[PDB]
C-alpha cells in the first residue's frame, strides 16, 4: 500500500483518461475508415474461417461504448508509462 | 565411442547399396 | 606440375620489380588481365549487349548527342572472334613473360 | 563416452523420421 | 476377422482368403507382382521347419545340457572334414529337388496332396490354419532363443527359472536392449493410430 | 446466460452441445465439423484430470504421497516394478482401451464409452447430471493448473497451501509469496 | 500423363532425353503444371516448407550427434586453446598406413577431421560440458523434426487442408511472426541465458534436474515486480573473471559493460541476456500493430493507399500495391531473399568483429570458414532476390491495375536507372583499375614514391566518431568534451573504448591506402551486379529489340539470329550473367578480408598496407606464400595432414575448367557429333541388339549454360574453400 503499488495505480489512470477523454474520438474515427480486406473483399467471405471480424465479444453499456479491448490497448500503454517511470531512475 | 563397428556397416550401405537401389528404381520409373 | 613447375618456376618473374627484367613482371599480369577479359566475350551473348546499348542511347539522346552512325553491338561471330583473340593472346603472352623472366634470370 | 545403448535408440528414432518422410513424400507427390 | 487389430481396413491383398490371414501387409509385399501363395509355403516351410526347430534346442537344456548353441560344437561323430557336411548335402536336395521343382510345376500346394509323404490324413485340410498358426507362434520364440543366448547366455529353461524365481527382476527391460525395447513398445502404441488416421482424417 | 455481460454471441453455436456459457473469444468454434472433436476432448480432459486432483488430494490430504511431484522419484512404491519396464506396461494396456474407446467414438455412437459399447452400468442420467459433467470438468482442469503454480512458486502441495493461507492470509497469497521467493 | 515428368504433358511426351533433364529441373516450379489451381498451388508449397523445415533439424541433429559420438568434447572443454575440435571420423576403404595415421590428429583413436565448422564453440558458450548434453540435445531435433513430417502429412488431407484465403491473410502472420515467432522466442532465449548459460558461465551446473531448485539471481522477482530494476545490473563481473568457473565472479544477470570478456575475448553474456530481453520487448509490442478478428489494429492497404504524396511526384503513390503483393508470390519472395540475404552478410560483418562466442578469435580458421560462408550464401540470395524480381515483372505484374503506381513510375523511366548505374560502374571501373595499374608500374620501375595513395579520410573520421583515438580528430566519442562521451560515460563507454583501442581484437581494424582502393572494387562489384540484375528486371517486360518478352516466356534461348542475331536476349540469361560478377565482388571481399587478417593474426600490419596498393602483392604475397603449404599435401615424399585439401584444391580447378566447355562451346557442334555416334552405335555389330529408348540429343541451349554455371561455381568455391582453410590450418595465423 505504498508508492510501488500506488504509482502504477496512479500512472495507469493517465492513459485511460486520454483514451476516453478525447482519443475515443480519433481511434473510433480511423477504425471506421480502416477495415482489412483482400482481393477487394474482406477475409471472411474469401473463405478464411478464422478471420471473421469479431464484434460479438465487443460491446458495453459504457456511456460512449468504451469496450474491453480498448481497455487492453490503453491499459497496456498505461503500463508502459508505469514501467518507464519506476524502472529507469535515470537522470531523475 | 563404443559403437565403433557401425561405420563399416553403414558407409558401404549408404555409399554403394542405396546408390545401387536408387539407381535401379529411379531408372525403371523413367519409362512406363 | 603445380608445385615443381608453375609454382616453383614462377618465383623468378614475381620477385622482379626495380630489376632489369621487371617488364616481364608487368606483362605477366598484363597477360592475365587480357585473358580473363576474354571470358567476357565468350560467356556473354549479343542480345544482352544490344539491349544495354538501347539504354545508353537514351542518355545521349536526352543530351542530344546521339551519333548518326547507330551503335550496334558486335555480331554473334564477331563476339566469338574477339573472344578467341584475347583468350589466346592473353594466354600466350603469359608463357612469353614466364619463360623469359625465368631463364634470363637463371640461364 | 556415450553409452552404446543410447546410440541405437537414436538411430532407431531417426529411423522413424525416415518413414514419416516416405509417408509425406508419397502423399505430396501423389498430391 | 481379428486381423491384428489395426482398426478396420486391411489392404485388399490380404482379405482372409489364404489360411491364417489376419490381413497384415505393411510393406505391400503381400501383393502379387509375381505371386503371393509362394510366400505361404515360404512362410510355411520356414514355419514348419521353424516350429520343429525349438524342440532341438528346447529339451537339451532340460536333460543333458549340451544346449543348442554349444550343441553342434562338441560331438565325436564328424569323420575327417567333408564327411560331416557331405553326407547331409545330398539327401535333402534329392527329395527337395523333387518337391521344389515338382510342386511349382505339379501344383501349388506344397506337399499337401502329400504324394511324396502319405500321412494318416484323418484330420486333413480344414484346420490347416492351426498348423500354420501353431508354428508361426514358435517362429517368434525362436528369435528369443537367440537373444536368450545373446543378451543373457543362459539356457532357455535356465532363463525360465530365473523369471520364475524373480519375476520382477528378470525382464528384458532391465538388461541391455531393455532400454531399446521399451522405446519400441512406446512407438508401437501410437502405431495403430497413424495407420488409422489415413482412413479417418483423409 | 452469456459469458460476460451481453454480447458474446456465436452464430455457429446454439449451446445444444453439452453446456454453454457462450464463451468462445478466439473463434475456434467455427467450421463446426471438427467442433465435434473439440467437444469431447474437453470432456476427456475434464473427465480425466478431475481424478488427478483427487488422486493428488486424497493421498496428500489423508495418506502417503505428500509431495506428489517427487512421487515416482521417491522410494517404496506399492509395486516395485522398475522405471524402465513400467513405461511399456503403462502404454500397452492403455493402448487397448484408448484405441478401442476411439473406434467406439469414431463408431456411430459419438459419446464416450469403454470396452466397446457399454457405458452406463447404472443408467443414471443423460441430462442434468450430464451437465454436471462439464461444469465439474471445466473447474477440475482449471483446478489442476493451480497445483502446478503451487509447486513452482511455493513448492508446497495444496494441503499445506490450504493450511498456509487460512493461517496467514496477508503474508501468504498469490502475490505475496511470488514476490517473496524463500520457499 | 504416364511417363516421368508427370506434371507436364509437353515433357511427358518427348522421344529424347530432354524429357529427362527438364523433368528434374521443372519439378519445383508449381505455377507451371498440368492444371494448378490457385488453391492447390499454395498447398504443395506450405507442405514443402515442412520438408525444408524438417530437413534442417535432422541436419542439426547430425552435427550434434556426431560431435557427441565420433568427436571429442570434454577433452576440448578442458583445453579450448591448446586442442582441436574433432568432427566425424574418416572411414575410407582407400588408404595406406600413412594417410590413416596422418589423419588421426586429435584426441580420438581413428582418423578424424578437425572441425572448422565453428558450431563447436557455440555449444560451449551456451555451455554444455558433457557428451551427454549433446546427445540429449541431438535427440530432440530428431523428435521435433518428426513432428513436422507428421504435420506435413497431416495438412494435405481434405479435412485439415487449409483454405486459400487462410494463406492470403497477411495481417495475422505479421502479428504472429513478429510477436510469437520473433518476440516470444527472444524471451525464451534470455530465459535460457539467465537460467542455464550465465550461471553455467560461472561454473554452476544446472540441468533439467536441478533447474528449478536454484535461483538465477539472489533476489527474487521482488526487484522485477517492485519496479526496481537495478539489482540485476548492480554487481557485474570482474575484469579477471575466468570463464566456466567461479573466480571473482560478479552476481549480476542483466548488465551491459560494452567490450569483451578478456578471458574469452568474447562478448559479455549478461550483455547478451540484456540484448534479447530488450528485443523481446520490442517485437511483442510491434506485433499488435496489424488488425485481426478483434477489429483493433491497422489495415495493410489503407496504410499504403494514403501515402501518395500530396504533390504527384509519385503520382498515385502506393495504390493497389497490397493487391499485387498479396497476389504475386514472387514479389513476396523477392523481398524475402533480399531481406534475409543482406542479413546473412550483416551477420558476417558483425560476427568476426564482435565474436559473440567464447574462445573464437583464438582459433582463427573457424572465423575464416564462417565469414566466407555467410558472404557467399548472402550473395546467392540477393541474386535470387532479383531473379524472382524479374519473374514478377515477366508474369504476375499487371500494368493496368498498377497504372500510375510506384512500380509503374519505375518502368516509365527504365533507362535513367540503367544509364546511371552504367556511369557509376564505369567510373569505379576505370579509376579503381587505373590506380592499381599506375601503382604497379611505379613500383615496377622501382620508385614506390610515385604511387597514387589516398588516405580513406571518411572511414577514418567515422572511426573517430566511434572514438578510435589513433587519429588526430577528437569528435564525439573521441573527445571527452563532446556531449556524447559525457552522455554514455556512465554505461557502455568505459568498456567499449577499451576493445576499440586495444589493437588485437578485430573491431574496427585500422584502415589505410590499400583499404581505400579495395572498397572501391567492392563498390564496383555491387553496382555491376545490380546493373545486370536491375536490367533483367526492367527489360523482362520488353526492350527495343524484342518487345515480346512478356509473352515469349521467362527463360528462353533467344529470338533467333534475326534483326541482328538476338542471343541471351531473355531475362534468365540476364540473371545468368550476374552470378559471374557475384563471384567476383564476393571473391574480392573474402580475399580482402583474409589477407588483412592474416597479417594481423601473424602479428604484422606491414604485409598488407605496404604491398596492398599494387596488384602484385596480392599475387606475389597473399597467393604465393599461402600456396606453399597446400601443394605439399600430396607431396611424393609423404602425406601431410593437409593432403585432404591438397587434392580438393585440384578438384576445385578441374570442375572450374570443365565449366568452360559448357559456357564456351555451344550446342550445334555437339548435336552433329552425337549424330555420328548414334550412327556408329546403331550400325556396329553386337550393339545392334542393345538400343536406347530415349533418343539421345545434345542438351538444350539454356540447359548447358545452367550446367555450365554450376561447374563454374562448384569449382570457384572449392578452390577458395581449400585455400582459405588450409592456409590458416597450415600456418595457424
Ligand atoms: C541444389 C541441387 C541439389 C543438391 C545437389 C545435387 C547434385 C545436383 C545434380 C543435378 C541434378 C539436376 C540437374 C539439372 C539439370 C537440368 C537443368 C535444366 O535444363 O534446367 C533448365 C530449366 C529449363 O527451363 C525451363 O524449361 C522449361 C522447358 O519447357 C517445359 O516446361 C514448359 C513450362 O510448362 C512446358 O511444360 C513445356 O511443355 C516443357 O517443354 C520451360 O521453358 C520453363 O519455363 C523453363 O524455366 O531452367 C530452369 O527452369 C532453371 C531452374 C534452375 C534455376 C537454378 C539455377 C541456379 C544455378 C545454380 C547456381 C549455382 C549453384 C552452384 C552451387 C555451388 C555450391 C555447391
Ligand atoms: C543430414 C544430416 C547428416 C549428415 C550429412 C550425416 C553425414 C554422415 N553420417 Mg550421419 N547421422 C545423422 C545425420 C547426418 N549424418 C543422424 C541424424 C544420425 C542418427 C541416426 C546419423 C547416424 C550416423 C551413423 C550411425 C553413422 C553416420 C555416418 C555418417 C557419415 C557417412 C555417411 C553415412 O553412413 O550416413 C548414414 C547415415 C544414416 C543411415 C542415418 C540416416 C541419414 C541421416 C538422417 C541423414 C539423412 C538426410 C538426407 C538428406 C536424407 C535424404 C536421403 C535420400 C533422399 C537422398 C557422414 C559424415 C557414419 C560414420 O560416421 O562413419 C564415418 C556412421 O557410421 N551417421
Ligand atoms: C483442454 C480442455 C478444453 C477443451 C478442449 C475445451 C473445448 C471447448 N470449450 Mg472449454 N473450457 C475449458 C477447457 C477446455 N475447453 C476449461 C478449463 C474451462 C474453464 C475456464 C472452459 C470453459 C468453457 C466455457 C465457459 C465454454 C467452453 C466452450 C468450449 C467449446 C467451444 C470453444 C471451441 O471450439 O474452442 C476449442 C478450444 C480448444 C481446443 C482449447 C484450446 C486451448 C489452448 C490450446 C490452450 C490454452 C492454455 C491456457 C491459456 C493456459 C492455462 C490457463 C489457465 C488459467 C486455465 C469447445 C468444445 C464453450 C461451449 O459451451 O462450447 C461447448 C463455452 O461457452 N469452455
Ligand atoms: C488417474 C489418476 C491417478 C494417477 C495417475 C495415480 C498415480 C499413482 N498412484 Mg494413485 N490414486 C488416485 C488417482 C491416481 N493415482 C485416486 C483417485 C486415489 C484414491 C483412491 C489414489 C490413491 C492412491 C494410493 C493409496 C496409492 C496411490 C499410489 C500411486 C502411485 C503408484 C500407482 C500404483 O501402484 O497403482 C497400481 C494400481 C493398481 C494395482 C490397480 C489400479 C486399478 C502412482 C504415482 C501409491 C503411492 O503412494 O505411491 C507412492 C499408493 O499407495 N494412489
Ligand atoms: C505464434 C504463432 C506462430 C508461430 C510461432 C509461427 C511459426 C512459424 N510459421 Mg506461422 N502462422 C501463424 C502463427 C504462427 N506461426 C498464423 C496465425 C498463420 C496464419 C496467418 C500462420 C501462417 C503461416 C504460413 C502460411 C507459413 C507459416 C510458417 C511458419 C514457420 C516459419 C519458418 C521459421 O520458423 O523460420 C525460422 C526463423 C526464425 C525462427 C527466426 C528468424 C529471425 C531472423 C530471420 C533471424 C533471427 C535469428 C538470429 C538473429 C540468428 C541466430 C540464430 C542462431 C541459431 C545462431 C514458423 C515455424 C511458414 C513455414 O515454414 O511453413 C510451416 C509458412 O509457410 N506460418
Ligand atoms: C527459398 C528460396 C527460393 C525459392 C523458394 C525458389 C523457388 C523457385 N525458383 Mg529460385 N532462386 C533462388 C532461391 C529460391 N528459388 C536463388 C537464391 C536464386 C539465385 C541462385 C534463384 C534463381 C532462380 C532461377 C534462375 C530460376 C528460379 C526458378 C524457381 C522456380 C522453380 C525452381 C525449379 O524449377 O527448381 C527445380 C530444381 C532444380 C532446378 C535443381 C537444379 C540444381 C541446381 C542447378 C544446383 C546444382 C548445383 C549443385 C548444388 C552442385 C552440387 C555440388 C556437389 C556435386 C559437390 C521456383 C518458384 C526458375 C523459375 O521459376 O523459372 C520459371 C528459374 O528459372 N530461381
Ligand atoms: C577481367 C575481366 C573483365 C573486365 C575487365 C570486365 C569489364 C567490364 N564489364 Mg564484364 N564480364 C566479365 C569479365 C570482365 N568484365 C565476365 C567474365 C563476364 C561474365 C560473362 C562479364 C559480364 C559482364 C556483364 C553482364 C556486364 C559487364 C560489364 C562490364 C563493364 C563494367 C564497368 C567497368 O568496370 O568498366 C571498366 C572498364 C575497363 C577496366 C576496361 C579497361 C580497358 C582500358 C581502360 C582501355 C583499353 C586499354 C588499352 C588502351 C587498349 C589498347 C589496345 C591496343 C589495340 C591499342 C566493364 C567494361 C557491365 C557493363 O556493360 O558496364 C557498363 C555489364 O553489363 N560484364
Ligand atoms: C503559460 C506559461 C508561462 C509561465 C509558466 C510556464 C513557462 C510553465 C508556461 C506554462 C504553460 C502551460 C502548462 C499551459 C497549460 C495549462 C493547462 C494544462 C490547462 C488545463 C486546464 C484544464 C481544464 C480547463 C479542464 C476542463 C474539463 C475537463 C478536462 C474534463 C475532462 C473529463 C472528460 C470529458 C473525460 C473523463 C474525465 C473528465 C475529467 C470527466
Ligand atoms: C466501473 C468503473 C468505476 C467508476 C467509473 C469508471 C469509468 C472509473 C469505471 C472504471 C473501472 C476500472 C478501474 C477499470 C480498469 C481497467 C484496467 C486497469 C485494465 C488493465 C489494463 C492493463 C493491461 C491489460 C496490461 C497490459 C500489458 C502490460 C501491463 C505489460 C507491460 C510490460 C512490462 C513492464 C514488462 C515487459 C514489457 C511490457 C509488455 C511493456
Ligand atoms: C527487382 C525486384 C522485383 C520486383 C519487386 C521487388 C521489390 C522484389 C524488386 C526489388 C528487389 C530487391 C532485392 C531490392 C533491394 C535490395 C537491397 C540491396 C536492399 C538494401 C537496402 C539497404 C538499406 C534500406 C539501408 C538503409 C540505411 C541503413 C541500414 C543505415 C542506417 C543508419 C546509419 C547509416 C548509421 C547507423 C545508424 C542508422 C541511422 C540506423
Ligand atoms: C562485351 C560484349 C559486347 C559489347 C562490346 C562492344 C559493343 C564493343 C564496342 C567497343 C568499341 C571498341 C568502342 C570503339 C570506340 C571507337 C573506335 C571510337 C574511338 C575513337 C578514339 C578514342 C580512338 C558485345 O556487343 C557482344 C556481342 C556479342 C557477343 C559478345 C559480346 C560481348 O561480350
Ligand atoms: S547462339 Fe543461341 S542465341 Fe546466339 S544465335 Fe545461335 S541460337 Fe540465337
Of G163, G298, G323, the CB nearest to A34: G298
C-alpha–C-alpha distance, residues G614 and G617, integer Å:
6
Spatial neighbors of G489 by CB under 8 A, at least 6 apart, are none
Q: Is C92 in the pocket of ligand 7 (CB under 6 A)?
A: no
Alpha carbon distance F135, C26 (integer Å): 92
Q: Do chains C and A touch (3 or more CB pairs under 8 A)?
A: no
Residue G138: name the closest of D21, E178, D2 by CA. D2
Q: Is the CB of G408 under 6 A from ligand 6?
A: no
Rounded distance, CA E160 to CA E154, Å? Answer: 9
Residue where the block lists cell 562466442: G357
Cα–Cα distance, G469 to G499 (Å, whole number): 12
Residue G429 near residue C40, CB atoms below 8 Å:
no
Chain F contacts of E185, Cβ < 8 Å?
87-88, 91-92
Q: Which residue has the cell 548335402?
A: E89
- CA dihedral sign of residues G103, G105, G106, G109: positive
Nearest bound ligand to CA G42?
A: 5
Return d(Cα E113, Cα F67) in angstroms, integer: 70
G272–chain A nearest CA distance, Å:
19
Q: Which three cell numbers stand for residue G722?
A: 581449400
Q: E179: distance to nearest CA of chain F, Å?
A: 7
Distance CA(G303)–CA(F110), nearest Å, equals 48
Decide the pairing of beta strands G266-267 and G260-261: antiparallel
Q: Give CATH for domain G1-733.
A: 1.20.1130.10
Q: How far is G641 from chain B (nearest CA, A)?
A: 22
Regarding chains E and F, contact by 3 or more CB pairs under 8 A is answered as yes
Q: At what angle do helices G131-154 and D4-30 cross, to 10 degrees?
A: 20
Q: For residue C95, what are the CA distances in angstroms to C14, C29, C100, F94, G405?
A: 13, 11, 8, 82, 58
Nearest to B1 among G3, G4, G70 (CB): G70
Q: 3-class DSSP state for residue G114?
A: strand
Cα G524-G528-G534 angle, rounded to 5 deg: 140
Our CA angle for G178, G180, G184, nearest 5°, is 105
| G98: nearest Cα among G115, G111, G89 | G111
* F47/A47 Cα distance (integer angstroms): 35
Task: Identify from B2, B11, B21 which residue to disrupt to test chain D contact, counting D C-beta atoms within 10 A and taking the largest count.
Answer: B2
Q: What's the CA gap between C42 and C64, in Å, rounded? A: 34
Interface test with D, best of E187, E188, E189, E195 (most D CBs within 10 A): E187
Which ligand 2 atom minimizes the distance to the CA of G62?
13
**Whole-angstrom distance, CA of residue C78 vs CA of residue G629:** 44
H or E segment at G266? strand G266-267
Give me F35's grid cell.
Answer: 467442433
Smallest Cα–Cα separation from G368: which of G348, G354, G350, G382?
A: G348
Kindly state the cell numbers that stand for G410.
519505375
For residue E201, which residues of chain G lie inside 8 Å, CB to CB? 154, 157, 159-160
Question: Can you tell me the distance from the alpha carbon of E141 to that of E153, in angstroms, rounded to the nearest whole number?
Answer: 15
D6 touches chain B (CB under 8 A): no
CA dist E77 → E31, E53, E83, E85 (Å): 46, 21, 10, 11
- Contact list in E for residue F103 (CB cut-off 8 A) is 7-8, 196
Half-sphere exposure of A84 (CA within 13 A, CB side): 9
Is any Cβ of chain F less than 8 angstroms from the Cβ of A52? yes
Closest partner residue to F30 (CB to CB) among A49, A61, A68 is: A49
Per-residue cell: G503: 589493437
- What is the spatial distance between Cα G383 and Cα G592, in angstroms, rounded to a whole number? 22
Other beta carbons within 10 Å of E110: 19
Angle between helices C46-62 and G513-541 in degrees, nearest 10: 100
Residue found under cell 595432414: G641
CA angle G413, G418, G420 (to 5 degrees): 105
> Does the beta carbon of G176 sit less than 6 angstroms from any atom of ligand 5?
yes
CA dihedral over G393, G394, G396, G400, signed as positive or negative: positive
- Domain ranges within chain G, ordered by starting residue: 1-733
Count how many domains chain A has. 1
Rg of chain F taking only CA atoms, in angstroms: 20
Contact predicate G68/D1, CB 8 Å: no
Ligand nearest to the CA of G347: 5
Beta carbons of D10 and G138 less than 8 Å apart: yes
Least Cα distance to G324 among G438, G407, G441 occurs for: G407
Give yes or no for a contact between G194 and G273, defined as CB atoms under 8 angstroms apart. Answer: yes
Please state the length of chain F: 183
In 3-state terms chain E splits into helix, strand, coil percentages (rounded to 5) of 50, 0, 50
Cβ contacts of G687 within 8 Å, gap of 6 or more:
G681
CB of B23 within 8 Å of a chain G CB? The answer is: no
Place of cell 465479444: A57
Residue of E nearest to D10 (CA): E180
Residue G92: other Cβ atoms inside 10 A: 11
Residue G613: all three cell numbers together: 596498393
Chains touching chain B, criterion 3+ CB pairs below 8 Å = D, G
Give the 3-state secondary structure of residue G89: strand
G554: which 3 cell numbers?
A: 521467362
* CB-based contact A9:A82 (threshold 8 Å): no
Rounded CA-CA distance G443/G461 in Å is 29
Amino acid at each position: 500500500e505504498l508508492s510501488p503499488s500506488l504509482v502504477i495505480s496512479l500512472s495507469t489512470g493517465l492513459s485511460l483518461f486520454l483514451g476516453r477523454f478525447v482519443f475515443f474520438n480519433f481511434q473510433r474515427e480511423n477504425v471506421a475508415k480502416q477495415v482489412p480486406e483482400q482481393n477487394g473483399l474482406t477475409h471472411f467471405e474469401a473463405g478464411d474461417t478464422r478471420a471473421k471480424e469479431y464484434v460479438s465479444l465487443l460491446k458495453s453499456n459504457d456511456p460512449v461504448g468504451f469496450n474491453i479491448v480498448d481497455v487492453l490497448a490503453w491499459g497496456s500503454i498505461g503500463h508502459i508509462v508505469a514501467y518507464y517511470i519506476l524502472a529507469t531512475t535515470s537522470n531523475g | 565411442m563404443n559403437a565403433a563397428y557401425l561405420p563399416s556397416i553403414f558407409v558401404p550401405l549408404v555409399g554403394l547399396v542405396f546408390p545401387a537401389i536408387a539407381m535401379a528404381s529411379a531408372f525403371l520409373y523413367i519409362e512406363k | 606440375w603445380l608445385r615443381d613447375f608453375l609454382w616453383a618456376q614462377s618465383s623468378q618473374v614475381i620477385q622482379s620489380y626495380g630489376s632489369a627484367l621487371s617488364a616481364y613482371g608487368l606483362v605477366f599480369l598484363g597477360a592475365h588481365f587480357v585473358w580473363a577479359f576474354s571470358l567476357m566475350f565468350l560467356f556473354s551473348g549479343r542480345g544482352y549487349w544490344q539491349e544495354l546499348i538501347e539504354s545508353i542511347l537514351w542518355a545521349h539522346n536526352k543530351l542530344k548527342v546521339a551519333p548518326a552512325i547507330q551503335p550496334r553491338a558486335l555480331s554473334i561471330t564477331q563476339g566469338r572472334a574477339v573472344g578467341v583473340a584475347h583468350y589466346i593472346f592473353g594466354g600466350i603472352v603469359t608463357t612469353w613473360s614466364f619463360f623469359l623472366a625465368r631463364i634470363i634470370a637463371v640461364g | 563416452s556415450i553409452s552404446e545403448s543410447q546410440i541405437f535408440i537414436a538411430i532407431f528414432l531417426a529411423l522413424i523420421n525416415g518413414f514419416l518422410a516416405l509417408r509425406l513424400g508419397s502423399t505430396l507427390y501423389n498430391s | 476377422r481379428p486381423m491384428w487389430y489395426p482398426g478396420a481396413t486391411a489392404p485388399k491383398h490380404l482379405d482372409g482368403s489364404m489360411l491364417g490371414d489376419y490381413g497384415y501387409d505393411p510393406l505391400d509385399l503381400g501383393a502379387n507382382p509375381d505371386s503371393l501363395a509362394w510366400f505361404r509355403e515360404a512362410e510355411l516351410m520356414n514355419g514348419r521347419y521353424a516350429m520343429l526347430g525349438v524342440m532341438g534346442g528346447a529339451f537339451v537344456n532340460a536333460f543333458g545340457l549340451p544346449n543348442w548353441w554349444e550343441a553342434g560344437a562338441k560331438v565325436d561323430v564328424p569323420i575327417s572334414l567333408g564327411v560331416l557336411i557331405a553326407l547331409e548335402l545330398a539327401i535333402f536336395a534329392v527329395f527337395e529337388y523333387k518337391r521344389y521343382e515338382g510342386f511349382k510345376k505339379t501344383g501349388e500346394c506344397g506337399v499337401l496332396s502329400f504324394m511324396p509323404f502319405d500321412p494318416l490324413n484323418m484330420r486333413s485340410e480344414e484346420n490347416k490354419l492351426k498348423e500354420l498358426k501353431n508354428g508361426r507362434l514358435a517362429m517368434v520364440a525362436s528369435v528369443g532363443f537367440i537373444s536368450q543366448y545373446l543378451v543373457t547366455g543362459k539356457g532357455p529353461v535356465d532363463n525360465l527359472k530365473d523369471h520364475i524365481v524373480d519375476p520382477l527382476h528378470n525382464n528384458i527391460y532391465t538388461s541391455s536392449v531393455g532400454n531399446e525395447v521399451t522405446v519400441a513398445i512406446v512407438f508401437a502404441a501410437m502405431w495403430p493410430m497413424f495407420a488409422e488416421a489415413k482412413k479417418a482424417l483423409g | 446466460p452469456m459469458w460476460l455481460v451481453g454480447a458474446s454471441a456465436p452464430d455457429y453455436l446454439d449451446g445444444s452441445m453439452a453446456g454453454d456459457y457462450g464463451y468462445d473469444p478466439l473463434g475456434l468454434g467455427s467450421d463446426a465439423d471438427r467442433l465435434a472433436w473439440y467437444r469431447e476432448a474437453e470432456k476427456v480432459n475434464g473427465r480425466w484430470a478431475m481424478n488427478a486432483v483427487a488422486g493428488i488430494v486424497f493421498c496428500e490430504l489423508l495418506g502417503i504421497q505428500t509431495n506428489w511431484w517427487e512421487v515416482g522419484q521417491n522410494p517404496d512404491l506399492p509395486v516395485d516394478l522398475p522405471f524402465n519396464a513400467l513405461v511399456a506396461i503403462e502404454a500397452v494396456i492403455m493402448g487397448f482401451f484408448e484405441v478401442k474407446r476411439y473406434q467406439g467414438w469414431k463408431d456411430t455412437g459419438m459419446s464416450g464409452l469403454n470396452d466397446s459399447f457399454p457405458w452406463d452400468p447404472l443408467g443414471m442420467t443423460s441430462e442434468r447430471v450430464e451437465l454436471a459433467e462439464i461444469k465439474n470438468g471445466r473447474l477440475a482442469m482449471f483446478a489442476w493448473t493451480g497445483f502446478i503454480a503451487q509447486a513452482v512458486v511455493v513448492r508446497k502441495g495444496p494441503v499445506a497451501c490450504l493450511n498456509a493461507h487460512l493461517a496467514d492470509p496477508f503474508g501468504q497469497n498469490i502475490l505475496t509469496n511470488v514476490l517473496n521467493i524463500p520457499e | 500423363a504416364t511417363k516421368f515428368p508427370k506434371f507436364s504433358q509437353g515433357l511427358a511426351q518427348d522421344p529424347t532425353t530432354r524429357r529427362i533433364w527438364f523433368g528434374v529441373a521443372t519439378a519445383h516450379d508449381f505455377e507451371s503444371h498440368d492444371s494448378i489451381t490457385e488453391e492447390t498451388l499454395y498447398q504443395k508449397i506450405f507442405a514443402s516448407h515442412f520438408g525444408q523445415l524438417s530437413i534442417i533439424f535432422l541436419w542439426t541433429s547430425g552435427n550434434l550427434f556426431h560431435v557427441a559420438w565420433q568427436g571429442n568434447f570434454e577433452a576440448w572443454v578442458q583445453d579450448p586453446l591448446h586442442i582441436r575440435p574433432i568432427a566425424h571420423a574418416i572411414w575410407d576403404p582407400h588408404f595406406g598406413q600413412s594417410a590413416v595415421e596422418a589423419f588421426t590428429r586429435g584426441g580420438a583413436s581413428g582418423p578424424v577431421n578437425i572441425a572448422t565448422s565453428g558450431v563447436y564453440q557455440w555449444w560451449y558458450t551456451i555451455g554444455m560440458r558433457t557428451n551427454q548434453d549433446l546427445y540429449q540435445g541431438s535427440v530432440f531435433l530428431s523428435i521435433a523434426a518428426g513432428l513436422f513430417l507428421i504435420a506435413g502429412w497431416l495438412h494435405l488431407q481434405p479435412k485439415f487442408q487449409p483454405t486459400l484465403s487462410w494463406f492470403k491473410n497477411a495481417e495475422s502472420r505479421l502479428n504472429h511472426h513478429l510477436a510469437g515467432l520473433f518476440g516470444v522466442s527472444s524471451l525464451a532465449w534470455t530465459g535460457h541465458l539467465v537460467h542455464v548459460a550465465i550461471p553455467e558461465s560461472r561454473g554452476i551446473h544446472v540441468r533439467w534436474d536441478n533447474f528449478l531448485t536454484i535461483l538465477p539471481h539472489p533476489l527474487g522477482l521482488k526487484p522485477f515486480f517492485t519496479g526496481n530494476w537495478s539489482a540485476y545490473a548492480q554487481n557485474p563481473d570482474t575484469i579477471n573473471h575466468i570463464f566456466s568457473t567461479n573466480t571473482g565472479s560478479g552476481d549480476a544477470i542483466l548488465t551491459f559493460l560494452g567490450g569483451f570478456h578478456p578471458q574469452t575475448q568474447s562478448l559479455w553474456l549478461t550483455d547478451m541476456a540484456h540484448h534479447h530481453l530488450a528485443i523481446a520487448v520490442l517485437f511483442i509490442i510491434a506485433g499488435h500493430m496489424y488488425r485481426t478478428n478483434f477489429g483493433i489494429g491497422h489495415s495493410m492497404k489503407e496504410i499504403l493507399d494514403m501515402h501518395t504524396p500530396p504533390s504527384g511526384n509519385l503520382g498515385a503513390g502506393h495504390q493497389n500495391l497490397f493487391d499485387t503483393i498479396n497476389n504475386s508470390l514472387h514479389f513476396q519472395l523477392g523481398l524475402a531473399l533480399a531481406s534475409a540475404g543482406t542479413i546473412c552478410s550483416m551477420v558476417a560483418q558483425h560476427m568476426y568483429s564482435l565474436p559473440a562466442y567464447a574462445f573464437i578469435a583464438s582459433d582463427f580458421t573457424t572465423q575464416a570458414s564462417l565469414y566466407t560462408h555467410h558472404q557467399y550464401i548472402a550473395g546467392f540470395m540477393l541474386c535470387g532476390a532479383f531473379a524472382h524480381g524479374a519473374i514478377f515483372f515477366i508474369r504476375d505484374y499487371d500494368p493496368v491495375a498498377n497504372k500510375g503506381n510506384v512500380l509503374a513510375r519505375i518502368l516509365d523511366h527504365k533507362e535513367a536507372i540503367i544509364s546511371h548505374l552504367s556511369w557509376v560502374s564505369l567510373f569505379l571501373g576505370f579509376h579503381t583499375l587505373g590506380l592499381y595499374v599506375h601503382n604497379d608500374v611505379m613500383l615496377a620501375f622501382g620508385t614506390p614514391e610515385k604511387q597514387i595513395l589516398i588516405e580513406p579520410v571518411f572511414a577514418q573520421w567515422i572511426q573517430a566518431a566511434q572514438g578510435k583515438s589513433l587519429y588526430g580528430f577528437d569528435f564525439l566519442l573521441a573527445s571527452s568534451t563532446s556531449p556524447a562521451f559525457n552522455a554514455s560515460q556512465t554505461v557502455w563507454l568505459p568498456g567499449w573504448l577499451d576493445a576499440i583501442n586495444n589493437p588485437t581484437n578485430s573491431l574496427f581494424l585500422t584502415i589505410g591506402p590499400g583499404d581505400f582502393l579495395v572498397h572501391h572494387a567492392i563498390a564496383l562489384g555491387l553496382h555491376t551486379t545490380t546493373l545486370i540484375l536491375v536490367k533483367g528486371a526492367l527489360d523482362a517486360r520488353g526492350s527495343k529489340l524484342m518487345p515480346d518478352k512478356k509473352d515469349f516466356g521467362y527463360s528462353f534461348p533467344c529470338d533467333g539470329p534475326g534483326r541482328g542475331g538476338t542471343c541471351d536476349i531473355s531475362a534468365w540469361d540476364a540473371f545468368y550473367l550476374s552470378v559471374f560478377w557475384m563471384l567476383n565482388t564476393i571473391g574480392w571481399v573474402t580475399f580482402y578480408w583474409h589477407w588483412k587478417h592474416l597479417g594481423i593474426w601473424q602479428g604484422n600490419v606491414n604485409q598488407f598496407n605496404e604491398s596492398s596498393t599494387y596488384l602484385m602483392g596480392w599475387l606475389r604475397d597473399y597467393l604465393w606464400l599461402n600456396s606453399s603449404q597446400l601443394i605439399n599435401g600430396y607431396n611424393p615424399f609423404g602425406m601431410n595432414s593437409l593432403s585432404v585439401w591438397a587434392w580438393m584444391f585440384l578438384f576445385g580447378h578441374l570442375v572450374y575448367a570443365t565449366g568452360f566447355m559448357f559456357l564456351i562451346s555451344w550446342r550445334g557442334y555437339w548435336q552433329e557429333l552425337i549424330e555420328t555416334l548414334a550412327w556408329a552405335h546403331e550400325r556396329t555389330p553386337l550393339a545392334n541388339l542393345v538400343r536406347w529408348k530415349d533418343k539421345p540429343v545434345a542438351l538444350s541451349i539454356v540447359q548447358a549454360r545452367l550446367v555450365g554455371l554450376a561447374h563454374f561455381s562448384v569449382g570457384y568455391i572449392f578452390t577458395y574453400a581449400a585455400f582459405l582453410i588450409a592456409s590458416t590450418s597450415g600456418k595457424f595465423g
